[PDB]
C-alpha cells in the first residue's frame, strides 16, 4: 500500500471495467428493446420494409461492442502493483463510457422506433431515420473516444 | 466536382504549413512540445500538399 498506490488500487480498475461493460450493455439492451418493438409492429404491415428496418438493432449492437471493447482495453491496464491513480482513471473512463452508452442507447432506441413507424407509414423517411440514427451514434463514438483517451492516460507513467 | 474545392484548400493549407516548417516559425516545430524536426515537418507537409493537389486534379472536371 504505497502513498499513491494503496492495496485497493486494482479495485477501481476492476470497477471501471465492470461499469464500462454493464452500463453500455444496459443502454444497448434498452435501444434493442425499442428497436424490436418497432420492428415487430411494422413487420405486420410492410414486411419488405421492416426486414430492412433492422438497422437500429445493428446500431445498438455497435454501441454494445464499443462498450465491450472499452472494457477489454481497461482490462489490460489492471494489476495489483498498479497504482491507485490509474485505478481511479480506469474507473472514471468506465463510468464515462457506460453513461455515454446509456445515452446513445436511449436516443437510438427512440429514434429507431419513431423511424420504423414512419417508414411503415411513409417510405420517404427511411433515409431521415438512418441519418438520425447516425447522428445519435456519434454520441456513442464521442464517449468511446473519451474513454479510450482516459484509459491511455491511466496506462501512462504512474508511481 | 465538389471535392475539388476541398482538395485545393487542403493543398493550400499544407503548402502554408510546409513553408512555416521550413521557416521554423514559433508555432509547429518552434514549440518544444512539438517535434523539432522542422525539415521533417516541411517534407511531410509538402508531400501532403502534393497528395492534395493530385486529388484536386482528379476531381477536376471540364463540363
Amino acid at each position: 500500500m504505497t502513498e499513491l498506490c494503496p492495496v485497493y488500487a486494482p479495485f477501481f480498475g476492476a470497477i471501471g471495467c465492470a461499469s464500462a461493460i454493464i452500463f453500455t450493455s444496459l443502454g444497448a439492451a434498452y435501444g434493442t428493446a425499442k428497436s424490436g418493438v418497432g420492428i415487430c409492429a411494422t413487420c405486420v404491415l410492410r414486411p419488405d420494409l421492416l426486414f430492412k428496418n433492422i438497422v437500429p438493432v445493428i446500431m445498438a449492437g455497435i454501441i454494445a461492442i464499443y462498450g465491450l471493447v472499452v472494457s477489454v482495453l481497461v482490462c489490460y491496464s489492471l494489476g495489483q502493483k498498479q497504482a491507485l491513480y490509474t485505478g481511479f482513471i480506469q474507473l472514471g473512463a468506465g463510468l464515462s463510457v457506460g453513461l455515454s452508452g446509456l445515452a446513445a442507447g436511449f436516443a437510438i432506441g427512440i429514434v429507431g422506433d419513431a423511424g420504423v413507424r414512419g417508414s411503415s407509414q411513409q417510405p420517404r423517411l427511411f433515409v431521415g431515420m438512418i441519418l438520425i440514427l447516425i447522428f445519435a451514434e456519434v454520441l456513442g463514438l464521442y464517449g468511446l473516444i473519451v474513454a479510450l483517451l482516459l484509459n491511455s492516460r491511466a496506462t501512462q507513467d504512474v508511481v | 466536382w465538389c471535392c475539388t474545392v476541398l482538395s485545393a484548400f487542403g493543398v493550400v493549407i499544407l503548402s502554408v504549413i510546409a513553408h512555416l516548417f521550413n521557416t521554423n516559425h514559433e508555432s509547429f516545430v518552434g514549440s518544444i512540445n512539438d517535434p523539432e524536426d522542422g525539415p521533417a515537418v516541411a517534407h511531410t507537409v509538402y508531400l501532403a500538399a502534393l497528395v492534395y493537389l493530385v486529388f484536386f486534379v482528379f476531381c477536376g472536371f471540364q463540363v
Binding site: - | 476541398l6 482538395s7 484548400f9 487542403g10 493549407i13 499544407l14 516559425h25 514559433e26 508555432s27 514549440s31 518544444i32 512539438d34 517535434p35 524536426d37 521533417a40 515537418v41 517534407h43 511531410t44 507537409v45 508531400l47 501532403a48 497528395v51 492534395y52 486529388f55
Partner: protein
C-alpha cells in the same frame, strides 16, 4: 422585429453596419472569417444565376443575405487581422513586443518581458502561454464592455434624434436626459475607469491597480474609498455620479406625466428602462462568451488535426495526414462555419434587438405595400 414610425428618409440604417461588426467581434478567427467571406462572395457574384435558380428552403434566406454575409465576412477578416489567430495561430506579421529571458531553461517555464506594445491586435508572443487565457479574458472583458457601451450610447443617440424629429418636449425632458444621466453616470463612468486603469502604468507608477469590479462594488454600496482609486477626485467624482444616478430615478418616475391614470404605464416603462439598461450592459459580455468559445473550439480542432496529421511524418504518416487535413477542413467548415457563424449572426442580431433597437424603436406602424403584380407563374398548389 416590427414596423417603424413615420417621418422622412428611411430608418434602421445603423443595423446594416453594426450587425456584421458585432457578429465579427465574436466570430474572431481570421481564417474562418476569410473563408465565410469567400463563400459570401461566391454566393454574391452569381446574383443573376442566383435569381434564375430556385430560391430553396434555407438558401432563400441565405441568397437574400448574399450581401449581409459578405459584410460579416469582411468584418470578421478584420477582427482576425486583430485577433492573432488564423486558426488559433498568431502569424506574427509585425514585431513581437515581448521577450523571454536570454537563456530559456532547458525544461522549466519562465516569464517574458516587454519593451513596447503590439502595433495592432494581441501581442504576437501570446501563443500557448499559460497566462494567455487569463490575459485574453481580462482583455475582452473591457473589449466587450466598451463596445457594448458604445453601441448602447449610439443607439441612445439615435433615440434622441428620433425624439428631436418630433417636438415631444415633455417626452424629451422626461425620458432622454435622465436615462442618459443613469447610463452615463454609472456605466460610462465604469467604462472610463476601465480606460484609465489601462492608461496608468501601475507597474512603473507603483500604485496598486484597483479592481474594476471592486470599484463598482464600492460605488454601489459604499461612499467609495476603495483599496485604490483612479484619482483622488475620481473617488469623489464616482460618489457624485452615483448620487446623480440615484437622484435620476424620481425624474423617470414623475417628470414624464407632467399632467394621471396613464402614468402607471410611464412608471412601468421607466422601471423597465432602468432594468433593461443594467441587464443589457451586463449581457454584452456574451459577445466575449461567443468569442472565447470560437477561439477554444478552433484551438481544439487544430489540436485534433495536428495529432491526426503529423504523427511521425513518415510515408504512412503522410498518407494519414492526407485524409486528416481534409477531415479537419470538413469538420471546421461544417461545425465552425455553418453553425458557429449562423449562431453568432443570430447572437449579434439578438443583442441588437435586445439593446440597440430597444433603445430607439418607438413601436409598431403601418407597413407599406407596393401592390405590384407577383409574376410568380408557378406553384399551382
Amino acid at each position: 422585429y416590427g414596423i417603424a414610425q413615420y417621418r422622412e428618409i428611411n430608418a434602421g440604417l445603423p443595423t446594416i453596419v453594426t450587425f456584421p461588426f458585432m457578429f465579427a467581434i465574436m466570430f474572431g478567427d481570421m481564417g474562418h472569417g476569410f473563408l465565410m467571406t469567400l463563400a459570401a462572395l461566391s454566393l454574391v457574384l452569381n446574383e443573376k444565376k442566383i435569381n434564375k435558380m430556385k430560391r430553396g428552403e434555407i438558401f432563400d434566406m441565405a441568397f437574400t443575405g448574399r450581401y449581409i454575409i459578405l459584410l460579416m465576412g469582411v468584418f470578421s477578416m478584420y477582427t482576425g487581422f486583430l485577433y492573432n489567430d488564423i486558426f488559433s495561430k498568431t502569424m506574427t506579421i509585425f514585431k513581437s513586443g515581448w521577450k523571454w529571458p536570454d537563456h530559456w531553461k532547458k525544461g522549466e517555464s519562465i516569464t517574458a518581458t516587454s519593451v513596447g506594445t503590439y502595433p495592432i491586435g494581441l501581442d504576437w508572443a501570446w501563443h500557448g502561454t499559460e497566462n494567455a487565457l487569463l490575459f485574453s479574458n481580462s482583455y475582452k472583458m473591457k473589449l466587450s464592455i466598451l463596445m457594448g457601451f458604445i453601441h448602447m450610447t449610439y443607439s441612445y443617440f439615435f433615440s434622441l434624434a428620433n425624439h428631436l424629429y418630433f417636438n415631444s418636449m415633455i417626452d424629451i425632458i422626461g425620458n432622454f436626459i435622465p436615462g442618459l444621466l443613469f447610463m452615463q453616470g454609472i456605466f460610462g463612468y465604469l467604462s472610463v475607469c476601465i480606460v484609465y486603469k489601462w492608461a496608468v502604468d501601475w507597474v512603473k507608477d507603483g500604485k496598486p491597480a484597483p479592481g474594476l469590479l471592486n470599484m463598482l462594488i464600492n460605488m454601489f454600496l459604499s461612499p467609495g474609498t476603495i483599496d485604490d482609486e483612479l484619482y483622488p477626485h475620481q473617488a469623489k467624482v464616482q460618489v457624485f455620479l452615483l448620487l446623480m444616478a440615484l437622484v435620476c430615478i424620481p425624474w423617470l418616475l414623475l417628470v414624464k406625466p407632467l399632467h394621471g391614470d396613464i402614468m402607471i404605464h410611464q412608471v412601468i416603462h421607466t422601471i423597465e428602462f432602468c432594468l433593461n439598461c443594467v441587464s443589457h450592459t451586463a449581457s454584452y459580455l456574451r459577445l466575449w462568451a461567443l468569442s472565447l468559445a470560437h477561439a477554444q473550439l478552433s484551438s481544439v480542432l487544430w489540436t485534433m488535426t495536428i495529432q491526426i496529421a503529423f504523427g511521425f511524418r513518415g510515408f504512412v504518416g503522410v498518407f494519414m495526414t492526407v485524409a486528416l487535413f481534409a477531415m479537419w477542413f470538413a469538420l471546421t467548415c461544417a461545425v465552425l462555419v455553418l453553425m458557429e457563424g449562423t449562431s453568432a449572426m443570430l447572437h449579434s442580431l439578438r443583442l441588437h434587438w435586445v439593446e440597440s433597437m430597444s433603445k430607439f424603436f418607438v413601436g409598431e406602424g403601418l407597413p407599406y405595400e407596393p401592390f405590384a403584380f407577383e409574376y410568380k407563374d408557378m406553384e399551382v398548389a
